[PDB]
Each structure stands twice: as C-alpha cells, then as structure tokens.
C-alpha cells in the first residue's frame, strides 16, 4: 500500500 | 529518487460541496468539485478552495473514495457509521480548519494501517449551532476496525485522553443518537 506520513504530505505542498 | 514523477495516492478521491440553495431534496444540493489521485493534485485543489471556516453556515465539504457517494444510501455507507468531532462556536476559529486539514491528510495518506480499507470518507459540516467533522467507515459492527480507526484519528488530531469521541451508525443517525463505541 502507498502510505504517506503527515511530514511527507506537508513537504509536498 | 527522481523528482519529475507525481506522488501517487493509494486511492483516487472525490471532493464534494453541499449548500442548501438548489433543491428542497437534500441530494440535489450536492456538487462534485473535483477528483485527484496524487499528492500534488490534492494540494492544487486544496489551495484553490475556501477554508471551511470561510464557508457560509449550512455548507459541507465531503472527501470520499471515488465510487462512494457521500451519503448514507451508498452501498459502502449504509451498514457503516462515523466517528464524530463536535466543535463549539469558538472552535470555528481555533480548530476547524486545522482539524479538517489533518482529517484530509489522514485519509489521502492511508493512515489507518490494516483498517484503511474500512474508511469511506470524511465530512465537515459548517453550522451556526456548532461545526462537525466526521470520518465515515463502511461497517458499524466491526468493533476492531472501528475502534482502531477512532484511536488513530484521535491521536492525529492531538486530542487528550479526557476528550472522548463517539461513533454512531448511519442507520441510527437516520432514524428519529446513541454511540456504538467511544475512544
Ligand atoms: C448526510 N445526510 C444529511 N441528510 C439530510 O440533511 C439533514 C441534516 O443533516 P446534516 O448531517 O447536514 O446535519 P445538520 O447539522 O444540518 O442537522 P442534523 O444532523 O439533522 O442535526 C438530515 O437530517 C437529512 O434530512 C441526508 N439525507 C439523505 N437522504 N442521505 C444522507 O446521507 C444525508
């Protein structure tokens, strides 16, 4: 499964 | 790792808007805003749209897995239910937008480990009496999955142990509500 942490999602903003 | 590739999501998601200004039937007030299946496209959409706190009272956003309509009647919601976050009026300013964004991130990031497939979507209701945010799951009788999802959510929102949240079945919500579970 493709999982993203909170940090990962925010860095990609 | 190369950086010209978008970061795909496990699921494609659909964002819906509701405002009670088109029909006297509830369902005809729903608008599909957009769909996305990458992190970059999520942010492009999120950056384009109003903060929940800036919506007129009576409006909703709903983010659901593509294929699941944001309503009780969907095959994947009818046996399901929601973890409900109830906000006081002052929390529109302090907590609504940050809690909603954290909810969106929980969803798109598949943050519920073995039970991510039980997640259907999430809804924010902007309301004059008090705003609500909820995560909707597919089966209200799966105690293990439901409780796990609630505990993840509470942890991700940073709610302390003395703040209890409740889970209600949609079948109960729709009938003229008790908690099936609390965490
Ligand atoms: C989520 N949903 C809301 N409605 C209708 O919209 C009304 C408002 O439901 P609401 O969830 O928007 O809450 P609100 O805070 O406005 O009021 P309350 O939750 O009833 O206290 C419901 O009572 C239904 O008549 C719905 N009607 C149908 N058929 N299906 C749905 O999934 C659905």
Author numbering:
A (entry chain B): 2 to 14
B (entry chain A): 31 to 206, 211 to 217
Published text:
The lifetime of binding measured in terms of the residence time (RT = 1/koff) was also found to be higher for the 13mer peptides (∼36 seconds) compared to their 12mer counterparts (10 seconds for sTIP-05 and 6 seconds for sTIP-06). Crystal structures of the complexes of sTIP-07 and sTIP-08 with eIF4E were determined (C and Table S1†). The essential interactions made by the parent 12mer peptides were retained. In the crystal structure of sTIP-08 with eIF4E, only the density for the lysine moiety (Lys) of the modified residue “Lys(ButPhI)” (&13) was visible, forming hydrophobic interactions with W73, Y76 and L131 in the patch and potentially engaging the side-chain of N77 via a hydrogen-bond. We computationally modeled the missing functional group of &13 and subjected sTIP-07 and sTIP-08 complex structures to MD simulations. The “ButPhI” functional group of residue &13 in sTIP-08 was observed to be dynamic in the simulation and did not form any stable interactions with the protein. Conversely, the “Lys” chain remained largely bound to the protein surface and significantly contributed to the binding energy (–3.6 kcal mol–1) between the protein and &13 at the C-terminus. This physical association with the protein could be the primary reason for the relative stability of the moiety and hence its resolution in the crystal structure. In summary, extending the C-termini of two stapled peptides with tryptophan or effectively lysine resulted in the efficient engagement of a previously untapped patch on eIF4E and an increase in the residence time of the peptide–protein complex.
The eukaryotic translation initiation factor 4E (eIF4E) protein is a vital component of the cap-dependent mechanism for mRNA translation. It binds the 7-methylguanosine (m7G) cap structure present at the 5′ end of mRNA molecules and recruits it as part of the eIF4F assembly which also includes two other partner proteins, eIF4A and eIF4G, to the translational machinery for protein synthesis. We have used a structure-guided approach to rationally develop a set of hydrocarbon stapled-peptides with high binding affinities and residence times against the oncogenic eukaryotic translation initiation factor 4E (eIF4E) protein. Crystal structures of these peptides in complex with eIF4E show that they form specific interactions with a region on the protein-binding interface of eIF4E which is distinct from the other well-established canonical interactions.
